[PDB]
Design a protein around this ligand. Structure first.
Ligand SMILES: O=C(NCC(=O)N1CCC[C@H]1C(=O)O)OCc1ccccc1
Length: 710
């Protein structure tokens, strides 16, 4: 099968660094420079062998054709109202980017409001964030090129969709919030830096500032409202209270669900916004999260995890702020996580809970916190919602593994608040009734029961003969909930596969305790949990090692790469997307410094000791047994992935090819594909999404010798 030869890659054997007495060699350190001729030549040489390998078999084209056909279905976001108009996103089916539409009434004819497709031939310019003025007459929107996190904010007058001259640069990881007087907008920006700022650089991002832009002026005139020069990693995001009276500043440092909370009563400013605001430091520490829901005068309602790992709602009165005085509006549930809360129709609260990895949605009274109405949902996830304080209706979007989704609407001015289907689309070609989703809980190494969803064709025999695709993430308090994936369903229908998603520790499925169970000293729990998920699928007869593929992206790329090093005997194929592979140097680049809250940092001897044991780049080793080789591996990254710099995957593949690829027993391929004009994943155009999944499933099919089932 392997008719190709791995490229020559120079090893800098002098690249040695001492980590607390532990000498670490990094022979491919030079791949950290994306601009050198050496690095460019490396990428070219790697793609040169990967592309023909992926395109040789007819299966890639078959998969691509089927994906193009089945993914071609109307895709709508739920409606949301701003001012006197309604807005919604819509993709006719295969447009590179979804389009923002506007209508003057629910019955009115909709018209194109913002079409990102006309900004590029290939759809590599995408919307990244936006904010309407409080009256809905003005609109600010961020644009990112080639998938970079960097944003350029532009503006439009809503009536007539008129482009305005205002342009804001150096924006990244920014908030967008208009003051209610309609004069301007708060946003974040980073100081100037040498070199590039286009997504191909690896420069660390520090000293993020909070600025206020007055509409109709040059960015150079912007007001500096908050800065933290003594704390380079702090990031202060601004939002206006519902009544427009207070600017709330949520300061974050790192990735834990915690934040300082400062406020500024705008009425108390000496003469409007003219400089550093008179911040009142309500919560001046990083011990808990305080997510603004709404306020009534000085009584502020926040969703918090302060001594409540499953989250709860509290009221903090700015006039009697001490913690002993806070009121618990909606107490913490013993097991269900309160995911998010919104205030609508003045005195209603919409609460979304996660019950065993499935969403529930309900309406509560703002004054007492009492449950008023349960909005029934099938097994799945709530992925969209609209309804602000002044609105008198809500829209919410539901999705699941077998259902593309349903958008519901509920008029809250009605006595009996009962929802109605607003929009529903079914994908012709995939009959939901032929498949089933089951949820099981398997014990991990330490006995902890971990949830896992398994999706497969009804009536299959559990004889271990089926190809399986097992996905996991495991970290950053992210919950991996049900979602509709045409690409995965094609694997089920056309490749006879079984899909599985393991809700391993590190995620947010069981609140902050679940998160803490998969970080820092306990990061190994994630890998153990995931390996145990694979062992469950095998023991129960869904699949066998040789037919099992594992996949994950970014922190999930780290997950599958570590699992390949630790248990190469358990997997037949591994697809690691945009993975964090160098755990000793991740903190040095772009926004990597923020991930130390989940991983630790190698500067600390204690942390280094945890990190060195699982870092993918530092644990590539030939399996001892002659009958064991590494699984087939495919790394996917892109040259503008400034979230997880591509050097991670470049150094990792060089190491795999040298240490393992050179061995005579290694017959499974170890490849990388580096895309252009793309980044971490957000905003990737439809055309690229299709090529990507086609590469993935063609790799699986060729390596495992799977025939296409028409
Ligand atoms: O870095 C992330 N998110 C985490 C992220 O993208 N990660 C964390 C690990 C690698 C990668 C991933 O898994 O996609 O977002 C940037 C940010 C914004 C505000 C405050 C701090 C940080």
């Amino acid at each position: 099968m392997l008719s190709f030869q791995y490229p020559d890659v120079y090893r800098d054997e002098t690249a040695i660094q001492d980590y607390h007495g532990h000498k670490v060699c990094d022979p491919y350190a030079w791949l950290e420079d994306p601009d050198s001729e050496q690095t460019k030549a490396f990428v070219e040489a790697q793609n040169k062998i990967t592309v023909p390998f992926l395109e040789q078999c007819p299966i890639r084209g078959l998969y691509k054709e089927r994906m193009t056909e089945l993914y071609d279905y109307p895709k709508y976001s739920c409606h949301f109202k701003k001012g006197k108009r309604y807005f919604y996103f819509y993709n006719t089916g295969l447009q590179n980017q979804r389009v923002l539409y506007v209508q003057d009434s629910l019955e009115g004819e909709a018209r194109v409001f913002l079409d990102p497709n006309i900004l590029s031939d290939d759809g590599t310019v995408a919307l990244r964030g936006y904010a309407f003025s409080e009256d809905g007459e003005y609109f600010a929107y961020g644009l990112s090129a080639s998938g970079s996190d960097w944003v350029t904010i532009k503006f439009m007058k809503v009536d007539g969709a008129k482009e305005l001259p205002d342009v804001l640069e150096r924006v990244k990881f920014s908030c967008m919030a208009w003051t209610h007087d309609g004069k301007g907008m708060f946003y974040n920006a980073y100081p100037q830096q040498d070199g590039k700022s286009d997504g191909t650089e690896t420069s660390t991002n520090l000293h993020q500032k909070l600025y206020y832009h007055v509409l109709g002026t040059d960015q150079s005139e912007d007001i500096l409202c908050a800065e933290f020069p003594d704390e380079p990693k702090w990031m202060g995001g601004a939002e206006l209270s519902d009544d427009g009276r207070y600017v709330l500043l949520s300061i974050r440092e790192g990735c834990d669900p915690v934040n300082r909370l400062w406020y500024c009563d705008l009425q108390q400013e000496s003469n409007g916004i003219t400089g550093i605001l008179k911040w009142v430091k309500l919560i001046d520490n990083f011990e808990g999260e305080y997510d603004y829901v709404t306020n009534e005068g000085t009584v502020f309602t926040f969703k918090t995890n302060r001594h409540s790992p499953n989250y709860r709602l509290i009221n903090i009165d700015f006039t009697d702020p001490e913690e002993s005085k806070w009121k618990v509006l909606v107490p913490e549930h013993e097991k269900d996580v309160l995911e998010w809360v919104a205030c609508v129709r003045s005195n209603f609260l919409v609460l979304c809970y996660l019950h065993d990895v499935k969403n529930t949605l309900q309406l509560h009274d703002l004054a007492t916190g009492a449950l008023l109405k349960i909005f029934p949902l099938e097994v799945g996830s709530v992925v969209g919602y609209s309804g602000q304080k002044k609105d008198t209706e809500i829209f919410y979007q539901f999705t699941s593994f077998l259902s593309p989704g349903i958008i519901y609407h509920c008029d809250l001015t009605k006595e009996e608040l009962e929802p109605r289907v607003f929009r529903e689309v079914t994908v012709k070609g995939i009959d939901a009734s032929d498949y089933q989703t089951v949820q099981i809980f398997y014990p991990s190494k330490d006995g902890t029961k971990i949830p896992m969803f398994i999706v497969h064709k009804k009536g299959i025999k559990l004889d271990g003969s089926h190809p399986a695709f097992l996905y996991g993430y495991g970290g950053f308090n992210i919950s991996i909930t049900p979602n509709y994936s045409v690409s995965r369903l094609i694997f089920v229908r056309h490749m006879g596969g079984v899909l599985a998603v393991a809700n391993i520790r590190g995620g947010g499925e069981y609140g902050e305790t679940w998160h803490k169970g998969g970080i820092l000293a306990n990061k190994q729990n994630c890998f153990d949990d995931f390996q145990c998920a694979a062992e469950y699928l095998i023991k129960e007869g869904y699949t066998s090692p040789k037919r099992l593929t594992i996949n994950g992206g970014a922190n999930g790329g780290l997950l599958v790469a570590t699992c390949a090093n630790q248990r190469p005997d358990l997997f037949g194929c591994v697809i690691a997307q945009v993975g964090v592979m160098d755990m000793l140097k991740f903190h040095k680049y772009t926004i990597g410094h923020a991930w130390t809250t989940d991983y630790g940092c190698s500067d600390s001897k204690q942390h280094f000791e945890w990190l060195i044991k699982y870092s993918p780049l530092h644990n590539v080793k030939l399996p001892e047994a002659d009958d064991i080789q590494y699984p087939s591996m495919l790394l996917l990254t892109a040259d503008h992935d400034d979230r997880v710099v591509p050097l991670h995957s470049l150094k990792f593949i060089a190491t795999l090819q040298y240490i393992v690829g050179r061995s005579r027993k290694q017959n499974n391929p170890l490849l990388i594909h580096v895309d252009t004009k793309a980044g971490h994943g957000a905003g990737k155009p439809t055309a690229k999404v299709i090529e990507e999944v086609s590469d993935m499933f063609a790799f699986i099919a060729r390596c495992l010798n799977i025939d296409w089932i028409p």
